[PDB]
């Protein structure tokens, strides 16, 4: 019943996915799109300095869909990193893991390319892994990688999936993750942000992600996320700390397509709830001492 070789070719393995999706409750696609993105983080989880440190840190949504699992997170696109060393060092290395592979993986990876950002020094970079197994193309990752800033890279959690086993891959998966403290330091940021006129703010998602993240920090002190929040905040010099978490006219529509899949979770159904959720929230961890 479970498999007991690893996949012959890509055939099979899609005919593997297929059934474990269907027998877990899961749309095909969401799960190997996260086989993708697992495999991609053991490419990343590879690179290590020399004293065996992870020079990569996943963040962001994939972090997330990671701590909660498939069924309590909204999908992920993108494989958002933090690199603790620098420039086209982590595109050569990705490189090179890409093509030693990984439990029959291979990925290939485009050029990276500066991004605009005002509070960032050095313009995060975006490219993609084209990923096969066995020699078949099987699928495609954009990949978002950062600089440090402040202590965001200082520690990390080590999180795992089974997703892998499930169809007969048996190698342990564990990725090297950005704090809980310093993704809530990032996403209030970016949910408070105000753009410049040519664009606007359309991270109405992130209220979701802020209610799931306060969820998983449990009973715990608030020191270390404060922290983190006015490090964020003076180290990217735009609006000061603490933030009013405004929504605008186009976030409730927004808000209401980040909620599709997570009627089981304990989560504000409507933006304006979830902007004084995640106010509450603010207050909750400027008071901590
Ligand atoms: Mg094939
Ligand atoms: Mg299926
Ligand atoms: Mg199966
Ligand atoms: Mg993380
Ligand atoms: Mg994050
Ligand atoms: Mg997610
Ligand atoms: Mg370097
Ligand atoms: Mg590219
Ligand atoms: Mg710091
Ligand atoms: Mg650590
Ligand atoms: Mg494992
Ligand atoms: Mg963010
Ligand atoms: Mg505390
Ligand atoms: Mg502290
Ligand atoms: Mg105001
Ligand atoms: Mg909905
Ligand atoms: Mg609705
Ligand atoms: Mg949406
Ligand atoms: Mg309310
Ligand atoms: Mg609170």
Request: aromatic share 6%; with cysteine; charged share 25%.
């Amino acid at each position: 019943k479970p498999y007991s070789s690893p996949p012959t070719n890509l055939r099979s393995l899609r005919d593997r996915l297929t059934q474990v999706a269907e027998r877990q409750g899961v749309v095909f696609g969401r799960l190997q799109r996260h086989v993708a993105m697992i495999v991609v983080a053991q490419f990343a989880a590879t690179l290590t300095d020399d004293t065996g440190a992870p020079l990569l840190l996943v963040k962001g949504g994939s972090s997330l869909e990671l701590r909660r699992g498939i069924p309590d997170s909204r999908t992920a696109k993108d494989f958002d990193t933090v690199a603790r060393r620098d420039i086209e060092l982590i595109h050569e290395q990705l490189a090179d893991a890409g093509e030693t592979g990984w439990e029959g993986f291979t990925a290939i990876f485009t050029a990276p390319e500066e991004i605009d950002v005002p509070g960032m020094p050095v313009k995060p970079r975006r490219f993609t892994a084209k990923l096969s197994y066995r020699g078949r193309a099987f699928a495609t990752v954009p990949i978002e990688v950062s600089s440090v800033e402040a202590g965001n890279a200082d520690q990390f959690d080590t999180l795992t999936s089974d997703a892998l086993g499930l169809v007969g891959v048996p190698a342990a998966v564990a990725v090297p993750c950005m704090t809980i403290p310093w993704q809530i330091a990032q996403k209030l940021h970016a949910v408070t942000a105000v753009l410049e006129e040519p664009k606007v703010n359309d991270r109405a998602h992130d209220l979701v992600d802020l209610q799931l993240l306060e969820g998983l920090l449990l009973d715990a002190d608030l020191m270390p996320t404060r922290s983190a929040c006015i490090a964020i905040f003076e180290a990217r010099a735009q609006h000061p700390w603490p933030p009013r978490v405004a929504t605008l006219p186009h976030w409730p529509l927004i808000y209401a397509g980040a909620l599709e899949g997570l009627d089981h979770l304990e989560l504000a159904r409507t933006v304006d709830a979830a902007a004084q959720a995640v106010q509450r929230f603010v207050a909750r961890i400027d008071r901590a001492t």
